[PDB]
A and B are shown apart, each in its own frame.
Chain A
Amino acid sequence: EKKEKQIEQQKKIQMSNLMNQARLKVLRARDDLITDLLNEAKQRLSKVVKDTTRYQ
């Protein structure tokens, strides 16, 4: 009678785990997009060094 009453929580436990795992994937993607923003910023900044008038 207790087990037959747990069934709602028993599955919704999997749903909250699956949704949080999907979010972890989304957070790793978002971090790499920020990382490539900083990679582009670093490459653009190298051009400001090559332009010796701006670099002075």
Chain B
Amino acid sequence: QSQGIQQLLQAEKRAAEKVSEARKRKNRRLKQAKEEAQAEIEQYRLQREKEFKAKE
């Protein structure tokens, strides 16, 4: 009998693991947004810098 309840602890542990992995993916993926935004901001900044240098 009791072994099935230990298998529920194992299922709970797998659930906590699945939740933790998804949360860690979200934490990294949210930081990747900042890193890619900064690259695209600099790409534009350098473009307006070039256009202004050309105008001058």
Contact = CB atoms under 8 A, between A and B. Distances in A.
Interface size class of B (residues with CB under 8 A): under 10
Interface residues of A, number: 4
Nearest to A11: B56
A3 interface: yes
B52 interface: yes
B31 interface: no
A3 B51 CA distance: 11
Contacts of A7: 55-56
Nearest to B56: A7
Contacts of A4: 51-52, 55
Interface of B: 51-52, 55-56
